[PDB]
Homo-oligomer: A and B are copies of this chain.
């Protein structure tokens, strides 16, 4: 259903500031975060496509101030099978 936006930081702080900046930027819903271990954590947002596209590049911009930002990517419409196997707040 909704699009997908992800920001992955080697520091807990970056993810928060990255998250807050994203929600404040456009009509998107923050769903939670996935700790991959080894420092790295990841914020996950979802919503209509163009807001996320505008959301991420507003978070990365506001999170690069704090520390390193590993990766930033946006999937406009994840395959049906993904949402059913990964914690992306659109599981049935």
A-B contact pairs, 16 of them (CB 8 A): A8-B11, A8-B13, A11-B42, A11-B70, A13-B72, A16-B78, A16-B82, A16-B88, A20-B78, A20-B79, A30-B81, A31-B85, A37-B40, A38-B39, A55-B76, A66-B71
| Chain B residues near A76 (CB-CB < 8 A) | 25-27, 50-51, 54-55
Contact residues, A35-92 vs B (CB, 8 A): 35-42, 48-51, 53-55, 66-68, 70-79, 81-82, 84-86, 88
Oligomer copy total: 10
Q: Name the contact of A38 in the complex, choosing from B20, B38, B68 (C-beta under 8 A).
A: B38
Seen from chain A, the residues whose Cβ lies within 8 Å of a Cβ on chain B are 4, 6-8, 10-14, 16-17, 19-20, 23-42, 48-51, 53-55, 66-68, 70-79, 81-82, 84-86, 88
